[PDB]
Design an enzyme around this catalytic site. Structure first.
Site, short mmCIF file in Angstrom:
data_model
loop_
_atom_site.label_atom_id
_atom_site.label_comp_id
_atom_site.label_asym_id
_atom_site.label_seq_id
_atom_site.Cartn_x
_atom_site.Cartn_y
_atom_site.Cartn_z
N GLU A 73 0.78 -1.25 0.00
CA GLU A 73 0.00 0.00 0.00
C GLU A 73 0.80 1.29 0.00
OE1 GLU A 73 -3.15 0.55 -0.62
OE2 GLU A 73 -3.84 -1.52 -0.37
N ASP A 86 -0.94 9.32 -3.11
CA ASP A 86 -0.85 10.25 -4.20
C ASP A 86 -2.11 10.94 -4.71
OD1 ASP A 86 2.01 9.32 -4.25
OD2 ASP A 86 1.52 8.38 -6.23
C1 LIG Z 1 -8.78 3.25 -7.70
C2 LIG Z 1 -8.11 2.40 -6.65
O1 LIG Z 1 -8.18 1.23 -7.13
N1 LIG Z 1 -8.34 2.75 -5.36
C3 LIG Z 1 -8.19 1.77 -4.26
C4 LIG Z 1 -9.32 1.69 -3.19
O2 LIG Z 1 -10.53 1.22 -3.81
C5 LIG Z 1 -8.92 0.71 -2.06
O3 LIG Z 1 -9.81 0.85 -0.92
C6 LIG Z 1 -10.84 -0.11 -0.77
O4 LIG Z 1 -11.91 0.14 -1.68
C7 LIG Z 1 -12.96 -0.85 -1.64
C8 LIG Z 1 -13.86 -0.61 -2.85
O5 LIG Z 1 -14.21 0.77 -2.42
C9 LIG Z 1 -13.68 -0.70 -0.31
O6 LIG Z 1 -14.77 -1.65 -0.32
C10 LIG Z 1 -15.85 -1.22 0.45
O7 LIG Z 1 -15.66 -1.75 1.74
C11 LIG Z 1 -16.74 -1.67 2.68
C12 LIG Z 1 -16.18 -2.43 3.90
O8 LIG Z 1 -14.94 -1.86 4.38
C13 LIG Z 1 -18.06 -2.21 2.09
O9 LIG Z 1 -19.13 -1.77 2.92
C14 LIG Z 1 -18.32 -1.56 0.75
O10 LIG Z 1 -19.49 -2.05 0.11
C15 LIG Z 1 -17.14 -1.78 -0.18
N2 LIG Z 1 -17.42 -1.10 -1.42
C16 LIG Z 1 -17.46 -1.78 -2.56
C17 LIG Z 1 -17.42 -0.98 -3.83
O11 LIG Z 1 -17.47 -3.03 -2.60
C18 LIG Z 1 -12.68 -0.97 0.82
O12 LIG Z 1 -13.27 -0.62 2.07
C19 LIG Z 1 -11.36 -0.18 0.67
N3 LIG Z 1 -10.30 -0.63 1.62
C20 LIG Z 1 -9.78 0.27 2.46
C21 LIG Z 1 -8.66 -0.29 3.29
O13 LIG Z 1 -10.31 1.40 2.64
C22 LIG Z 1 -7.45 0.92 -1.62
C23 LIG Z 1 -6.94 -0.03 -0.53
O14 LIG Z 1 -6.56 -1.35 -0.98
O15 LIG Z 1 -6.59 0.71 -2.72
C24 LIG Z 1 -6.74 1.68 -3.74
O16 LIG Z 1 -5.93 1.21 -4.77
#
Ligand SMILES: CC(=O)N[C@@H]1[C@@H](O)[C@H](O[C@@H]2O[C@H](CO)[C@@H](O[C@@H]3O[C@H](CO)[C@@H](O)[C@H](O)[C@H]3NC(C)=O)[C@H](O)[C@H]2NC(C)=O)[C@@H](CO)O[C@H]1O
Length: 185
Positions: A73, A86
């Site tokens: 990460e 970033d």
């Molecule tokens: C563009 C890029 O790829 N950005 C990345 C981030 O997406 C990622 O964070 C994680 O994103 C997912 C999808 O948004 C999050 O999932 C959500 O999680 C909750 C539970 O925590 C759930 O209620 C939601 O429904 C779910 N949303 C979806 C769309 O399924 C997730 O929480 C994020 N994880 C963190 C640690 O915040 C980050 C981290 O790996 O990476 C970027 O690359």
């Protein structure tokens, strides 16, 4: 203690995709690449070893998994600006996404690590319920994959990482984690 959710050493992994490796400056990909990257981050990781270990122990998750997530990460803080990634969306060593969770604590402290690890565990649990005929280690893998792309993206064991960043999330993290495990995490 640290084994409630599985053992990283038992997880099969294909490691880093070339999409992750190359940009990191390597000419080869896979497991060995993951491990070399992890090695490059060891010294910075070591600054947080105690905390990583403490949280692992507290939540009953392998510290090496936390370290592998941190390496992937943020390179253990190296690529952060006052804790932000970033794009200004992820915060901390574990990059909790501000859009989905309000970030808690300082960027490189125990509160943050706890929050990030908590989010991971919640994903592990979701996966456990979703695929109860999988082995625990398999569920751990699935959980790590969901950390990046959400649980909805995990529809099978074999292709879970398709759709994550670089299509290798969990495979890379697991390989990085295997290295850490060997280094006392
Ligand atoms: C563009 C890029 O790829 N950005 C990345 C981030 O997406 C990622 O964070 C994680 O994103 C997912 C999808 O948004 C999050 O999932 C959500 O999680 C909750 C539970 O925590 C759930 O209620 C939601 O429904 C779910 N949303 C979806 C769309 O399924 C997730 O929480 C994020 N994880 C963190 C640690 O915040 C980050 C981290 O790996 O990476 C970027 O690359």
């Amino acid at each position: 203690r640290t084994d409630c959710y599985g053992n990283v050493n038992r997880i099969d992994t294909t490691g880093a995709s070339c999409k992750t490796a190359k940009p990191e400056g390597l000419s080869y990909c896979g497991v060995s690449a993951s491990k070399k990257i992890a090695e490059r981050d060891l010294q910075a990781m070591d600054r947080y070893k105690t905390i990583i270990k403490k949280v692992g122990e507290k939540l009953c998750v392998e510290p090496a998994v936390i370290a592998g997530i941190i390496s992937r990460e943020s390179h253990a803080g190296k690529v952060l600006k006052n804790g932000w990634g970033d794009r200004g969306n992820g915060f901390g060593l574990m990059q909790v996404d501000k859009r989905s969770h309000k970030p808690q604590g300082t960027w490189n402290g125990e509160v943050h690590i706890t929050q990030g690890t908590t989010i991971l565990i919640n994903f592990i649990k979701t996966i456990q319920k979703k695929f109860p005929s999988w082995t625990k280690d398999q569920q751990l893998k699935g959980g790590i994959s969901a950390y990046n792309a959400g649980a909805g993206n995990v529809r099978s064991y074999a292709r879970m990482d398709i759709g994550t960043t670089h299509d290798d999330y969990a495979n890379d993290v697991v390989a990085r984690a295997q290295y850490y495990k060997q280094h006392g995490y």
